[PDB]
Design a protein around this ligand. Structure first.
Ligand SMILES: [Mg+2]
Ligand SMILES: [Mg+2]
Ligand SMILES: [Mg+2]
Ligand SMILES: [Mg+2]
Ligand SMILES: [Mg+2]
Ligand SMILES: [Mg+2]
Ligand SMILES: [Mg+2]
Ligand SMILES: [Mg+2]
Ligand SMILES: [Mg+2]
Ligand SMILES: [Mg+2]
Ligand SMILES: [Mg+2]
Ligand SMILES: [Mg+2]
Lengths: 440, 440, 440, 440
């Protein structure tokens, strides 16, 4: 699956729709980023610039100009073609091919931006600009606005009003289109295939990083070159660290391993967590914690639908957790009191769900305590977990256990669609999968 | 192989040896680096800070203070321990364990650096600081020096002399120790195993990125999690782009594929290029260009030794190239004239060799036109190539061919040691390897 | 005359009137300014901050908050009282006395501004801020807006809309109130008395700076301590330099001297230019140029009224100038052609009039080529001049003559009021004045 | 008196003498400084740049290059000549006339500095630069050093060593030459004449600012256009504020008035304080405090000579003060105990002496607690004072009295020369002077 030329067009028009007449929106590309000395990390475009262009170069600026309610046009600034730079660092779109390729009306050299941008903003009332996003962008925009302010004698005037387009653009990104859902559907399949493979390959004596290698190879083979975030492979006590990425330890028979990993496919993030026994067999103590987390997930998957909220479902998960923990003697006392005292917090200290999209922790307003009413098109994670510290004052068998199980869902008209259910999570199915792999 | 506590100690003492009495050297850690929104790229420590510490955290500063010719001490600034931050983002060394772990005399909280650094520089004559390396570092150092300048009434004085330690430190890094050579020896084996695997897996119909996936999996399985630079898989005309990293095309029967890839093992870079037929069989036209590049490499490997230079060997390679190209009718005229006119430059437009170490394009002074006399302990690449543009005015059969063959070497007492010869480069051996893999 | 507490109040309310509901306006004080090392120039408050407060301290910020159409309040940030700092550098208002003294609702320590400002902007829709005016202000405002943007989990939100208040505030300053006109009326008297005195004291052999001294002493004695701009005393050829401030030459019998000087009285600028003979007697050649400039001024003073413009009156002055210059043989040809060719420009190369107020070159929109229709309450200069270069190709007797005559006026219902006519400008009256003084 | 071409030359050569071979010193001009909107304060050159050039323009940089022990040359960067800018803002030296006028070897356009400076520093070992002095300078220098660092392939190299020239240059400025002493001698006469005049003009009912006006007029008439610092006229309780500059109160019969004022003559500061009765007659209570301050000054003037220090003389002044104050019942107890308890500090809370020169608070190292041994050529103030707060718990008659008496001296071979003794300070001589003036 992919995002069409026409979809990028629709998104631009939808932003322009909400802009005031006599205004310009300015969307800047991500800078290149040093890894060490003269080497650079693989380039990752700014999500918002990507959202409106599908253009994967730095030193580019999309300018959307609205003259009035029926008249608007687009100008791209981008790198000029250069035989020497391209022989070295790779091909460039340039100005000639850009109008057709990206569906913009006009394209100019990024090197001319300081000589051209102020002319585009001259006489407008409003400029939409994400102030503070990138320092190089602020310099360019402030420089342009100063020329206009001080150019009274050359009959120049600056827009007096500057508006942050991020609330508007992020509200758009919060609701996925059918094309976006298809792309995320495939991201979820790819990511699920990766997690299935990690389960199948896992043996005692392998290092945590080895499963990272298997996962990244599986991402890559389906055309998802990069992860959406740094892969987490926390075996044993490392599972109690939420974003453990060292992945440096030998995996030991008897421990669990928690894998949080997600591919990036056409810009969109998968995000799956699966926890399982390194030796393919859950112990009683591991099952007892796992079952609480799994019931939390399974109940949440039944509940999530239009009209409820992350806050409301989180409440049901807390009840399930506190009850499970009391029955095991990890918590003591009255359930309803313990809930009122948030007694679960030492063991479940993060949110149940975050938005998912072009960013793994996606943009969009949550409301107070994530109380926003869910509607169809929202995409989010469901990721309950229990993390019992090595030194927690609880029965010994539970100490040093970290379990999280995470699925990705899209809210539909009547409920939700699970994008990541193709990788197993019921303990018996995990055990069958690993047994089958060990024969073969 | 690894770098010992004692080696890090020796390096610090060797820097201190060259510092003036009454001075302090300040070495700063790399900042964390955003990939998109709140996600960050895998952390890569500054090479120079790593060189003196083997410490892989940000927000850290090594301060080496020389009182006189026999008295010196070290102070580390580093992140404080924090239960909440560690439950989330992973374990931290802290101040207590740092003296023993990293062999420094004292360790303070990075959060106290503005209250403590000026006290450490007070009354010194000289401060060694890499001005411009990182903006956050300059702010901290300038802030400290200003307090001292303006603190006359509190009996404070600033060092009047600031010296860049990069020439000195980079001159040290240019000469590898036995431990460093062992680590690079292993980086070369790992990288070679990766390139061998890519050759064995390559089939027509696979995409360039698939070989990237095989290479990264092989790096990872030997404990080299990250590449030293963004992997290059240029098939067909993409081979004529020196740093082609899109790796997005279907590999076609009949084309060559050029792979430039290198692992990062304990901080040190491997860097290998191998070019080969996608279908396992070189054509006449491909052999004719390949043989010129291979003779260039093989001759360079015979020549490199103490007493010569990159410039001098490059001269021999130019002769070999210009002659080969004349015999094929790609160049016309007298060899010696064509050499004097640098007629090879449209086809070989980069240097033969760069320094290799903690950075793939390593630090250290080359001399004018890379004329520096080679000595034992220097580590460098040997990477001749020929790149015939798709539109070059040459016989049709050579158009769109890009071939590079790259090995990594260390200069020894009597010649050089090739760290990357475990992956084949003679065409007959490449063909046998791919045939053998295809049976299976 | 002075500006009342109630007037400052009215101005704030008039700004608040035009602000959107759910917004805050932020007006910052001028920074202190180094003259050399640890000495500072006499403090000059930002005109706009002064306009709304009459408060003469740095490190102060006026915040006007509009909740809705009938509810608003004001918060001042200002320096805290400090016995040590006040024993040294002078008294401070502080927080306790500020509400009553400056008519604001609340006053907080400037040192707490970063901990308090974001709380004041939290939940608002719009912030009015003069972006780029002062770097220290931008840092404070951007810092506040970032806290809000990133404080989603602490239920903070930033205003998405930022509006420059300078167009609005400067449009207010363009129309003077009765109190402002009374203050400028007195500034004009004081400035006129200064120019009269300079004429009376001038003798051949005195230096240009001596008349500067007489002028500044006269400003000071009526309570106008500082000039509104650096005084210009250009004798001889120095009169051809528009903003000659070196004032370093001996004044010579036979030359003219051009004095452009203006006091600053309660913040408001006077701005007068008078040119006269150093020896008290105009020559024929000097009269011939002077009379053209004087007719230009006198005609402009008759013409200026509501309904015309600076552009339109400037047209009449050009006609007068071009005709005068043709009759003297300084220009040759047809008057109407020479006008169409702007042939006057080598001799009159500046505008006839600028706005006058809290700044000598006052704020307010001029329109294209200063075409804005004049209305009652606008205050402006009338300053025609002719400057014949020492090397101009014109009859010798005119070379090196610089003459300007400048009055300050306020547009009234039926015409204008001249605030500076108490110093003479008709040549016979100048000569009588200087003769009378010489007896003284 | 003035500073000769040859003296400026000598100073440059004396700096060059102390510079390392293979180095360049960079000395930058002061920026222009806004007073309000588009008006600027009178330009004041950076003292150190002035010290080596006598050049009074901004956008200028002196570069002194030392190749070796007998070879050096100078390059000036300065504003280019421009007919339009000069017709407006005044004459400019330009490049052609600068070598001869300022005795430099070469002169280039300031607008070309970024294209030329790095070429001047290329291949040098050391650059002397006052880091942090001006941001515009740091940008220019860092920009130049970065080009060199990164220009290895263009055979460029940066000096690795940067040295602050301010300690060296300020140590030079601490010792005045005969020409400098002559100029300061005249600054002291001019300043003294001003203070004499203020005493003669003072009447009850005049405002503090009126005496400021008389003082500035007297500075101006002897060719000292600007004060060296903001004039202080503190009558009554305002005399207890050390740097009272509001000068806004009516002077009242019965009060004292403290005047601290100093001219700037050819760059050099006078600095005199005289305190006297507004009505020309000291009261008993005023005499009792005045006599202690005067004995302090007179004793200090006898003591100051080579071999002593500011610290040592300050000790004698403390004894005199503490004794005087005990005899009046302002302090109670044993003198030697009260000295040991620094009991004088509530009444004398500043230093006795500061260096004087191109800055009123001149550059140069004081030593701990101003213990530096005095030598001939040092120029300094002697300014004891007693300031009894309005609310001090002391006999009523002393409350609200502020008295300071300040003279300027140069240390000679055998003692000191008083540059400011031409204005009276013995109370009987003050009273005679004011009586004589009143007849006016
Ligand atoms: Mg996750
Ligand atoms: Mg997640
Ligand atoms: Mg256990
Ligand atoms: Mg390579
Ligand atoms: Mg290489
Ligand atoms: Mg071909
Ligand atoms: Mg004027
Ligand atoms: Mg004017
Ligand atoms: Mg003449
Ligand atoms: Mg003084
Ligand atoms: Mg003083
Ligand atoms: Mg009294």
């Amino acid at each position: 699956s992919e995002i069409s030329r026409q979809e990028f067009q629709r998104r631009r028009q939808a932003l322009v729709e909400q802009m005031q007449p006599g205004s310009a929106a300015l969307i800047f590309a991500a800078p290149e980023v040093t890894r060490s000395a003269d080497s650079e990390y693989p380039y990752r475009q700014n999500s918002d610039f990507w959202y409106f262009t599908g253009f994967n170069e730095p030193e580019a600026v999309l300018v959307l100009i609205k003259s009035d309610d029926t008249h608007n046009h687009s100008v791209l600034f981008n790198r000029v073609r250069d035989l020497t730079a391209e022989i070295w660092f790779g091909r460039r779109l340039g100005q000639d091919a850009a109008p057709e390729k990206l569906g913009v009306d006009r394209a100019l050299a990024f090197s001319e931006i300081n000589q051209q941008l102020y002319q585009l903003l001259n006489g407008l009332d409003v400029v939409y600009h994400a102030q503070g996003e990138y320092a190089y962008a602020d310099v360019i925009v402030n420089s342009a606005l100063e020329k206009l302010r001080k150019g009274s004698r050359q009959n120049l005037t600056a827009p007096a009003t500057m508006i942050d387009w991020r609330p508007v653009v992020h509200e758009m990104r919060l609701f996925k289109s059918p094309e976006e859902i298809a792309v995320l559907r495939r991201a979820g399949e790819i990511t699920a295939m990766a997690h299935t493979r990690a389960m199948e390959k896992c043996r005692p004596g392998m290092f945590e990083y080895h499963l990272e290698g298997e996962i990244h190879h599986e991402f890559n083979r389906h055309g998802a070159r990069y992860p959406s975030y740094n892969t987490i492979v926390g075996s044993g006590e490392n599972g109690c660290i939420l974003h453990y990425t060292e992945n440096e330890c030998e995996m030991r028979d008897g421990d669990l391993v928690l894998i949080d990993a997600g591919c990036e496919y056409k810009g969109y993030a998968g995000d799956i967590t699966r926890t399982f026994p390194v030796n393919g067999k859950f112990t009683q103590a591991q099952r007892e914690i796992y079952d609480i987390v799994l019931e939390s997930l399974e109940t949440s998957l039944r509940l999530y639908r239009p009209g409820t909220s992350i806050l409301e479902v989180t409440g049901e998960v807390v009840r399930i957790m506190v009850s499970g923990l009391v029955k095991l003697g990890i918590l003591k006392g009255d359930v309803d009191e313990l809930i009122a005292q948030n007694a679960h917090r030492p063991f479940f200290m993060h949110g149940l769900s975050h938005w998912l999209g072009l960013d793994v922790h996606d943009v969009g307003v949550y409301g107070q305590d994530r109380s926003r009413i869910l509607e169809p098109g929202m995409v989010l994670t469901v990721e309950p977990g229990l993390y019992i510290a090595p030194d927690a004052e609880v029965p010994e068998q539970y100490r040093g256990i970290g379990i999280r199980i995470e699925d990705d869902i899209v809210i539909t008209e009547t409920g939700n669609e699970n994008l990541t259910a193709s990788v197993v999570k019921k303990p018996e199915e995990i055990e069958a999968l690993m047994v089958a792999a060990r024969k073969q």
